[PDB]
Amino acid sequence: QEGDPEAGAKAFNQCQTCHVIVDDSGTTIAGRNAKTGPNLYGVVGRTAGTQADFKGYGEGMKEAGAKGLAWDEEHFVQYVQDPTKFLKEYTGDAKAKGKMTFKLKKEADAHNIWAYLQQVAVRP
Numbered sequence: 700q701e702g703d704p705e706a707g708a709k710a711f712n713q714c715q716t717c718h719v720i721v722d723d724s725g726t727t728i729a730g731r732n733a734k735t736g737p738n739l740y741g742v743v744g745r746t747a748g749t750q751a752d753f754k755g756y757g758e759g760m761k762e763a764g765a766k767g768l769a770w771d772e773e774h775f776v777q778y779v780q781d782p783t784k785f786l787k788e789y790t791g792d793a794k795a796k797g798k799m800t801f802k803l804k805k806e807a808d809a810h811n812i813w814a815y816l817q818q819v820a821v822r823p
């Protein structure tokens with residue numbers, strides 16, 4: 700949204716160590732074939748913990764999705780900054796833990812990356 704998608708595309712390289720954005724036709728829009736985390740194509744508005752081919756979600760992420768968490772900009776920028784804290788607050792369970800061990804230190808980068816995803820990773 701108010702973020703800068705081009706700056707986001709650059710900031711997304713950090714995420715490629717574990718993620719990929721491949722569309723429904725098999726085209727790689729961003730990534731290096733890493734499969735640690737789920738495919739981010741179609742994340743916008745997706746219920747957390749539901750990508751059909753990702754078999755590595757933790758129980759905290761599955762729980763949050765069951766609670767009704769779908770990815771929007773406000774939840775996405777809180778989550779990428781500290782995934783385990785975010786999951787504990789949302790879920791209401793303090794023992795919750797995220798499998799994503801990367802924390803994005805800059806808020807601006809979080810908003811830019813969200814604007815980049817609204818440009819390339821929205822599924823119809």
Ligand code: HEC
Pocket residue numbers: 711713714715716717718735736737742746747748749750755756757758759760770775779796797798799800801803812
């Ligand atoms: C590996 C060390 C990772 C890096 C680098 C990043 N992510 Fe990640 N991400 C990873 C895993 C293992 C998972 C599963 C989390 C779990 O607890 O189950 C995730 C998940 C996400 C999600 C949720 C998507 C969904 O399907 O619900 C998002 C929105 C996400 N990751 C975004 C993201 C971004 C933008 C990154 C770069 C700043 C990033 N991740 C890095 C592992 C790793």
